[PDB]
């Protein structure tokens, strides 16, 4: 069976950093996939997204990943976060 539990958005952000290189290169793909899956299950708020800078991180991880599912899930997540930020400027 599959088992998971909720985590705070900062813990989810931390798990990502521990699963990638500072250049956003993937080091622990299974953990990165689980982080994306965790964010798709547990939405973050605009204010929290801003401090966590997760919007920028997921976007660059998406550029460095060779795994298309990771890139597709990241695309879904970022599309959701576009409305979460709702920018009217740069």
- What angle is formed at CA 21 by the lines to CA 15 and CA 36, rounded to 5 degrees? 40
How many angstroms separate the most distant Cα atoms in the chain? 45
13 Cβ neighbours under 8 A, 6+ residues apart? 52, 54, 57
How many structural domains does the chain have?
Answer: 1
How far is the C-alpha of 17 from the C-alpha of 85, rounded, in Å? 22
**Residue 42: closest CA among 13, 62, 71, 68:** 13
Method: NMR
φ and ψ of 7, to 5 deg: -140, 160
Domain that holds residue 18: 1-90
Task: List, in sequence order, the alpha helices (H) in 1-90.
Answer: 9-17, 29-41, 46-52, 54-64, 68-85
Which tokens is 35 given?
Answer: 């982080």
How far is the C-alpha of 71 from the C-alpha of 73, rounded, in Å? 6
């Amino acid at each position: 069976s599959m088992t998971a539990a909720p985590a705070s958005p900062q813990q989810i952000r931390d798990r990502l950093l521990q699963a990638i290189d500072p250049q956003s290169n993937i080091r622990n793909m299974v953990a990165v996939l689980e982080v994306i899956s965790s964010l798709e299950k547990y939405p973050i708020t605009k204010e929290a997204l801003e401090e966590t800078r997760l919007g920028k991180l997921i976007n660059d991880v998406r550029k460095k990943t060779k795994n298309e599912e990771l890139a597709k899930r990241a695309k879904k997540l970022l599309r959701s976060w576009q409305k979460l930020i709702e920018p009217a400027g740069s």
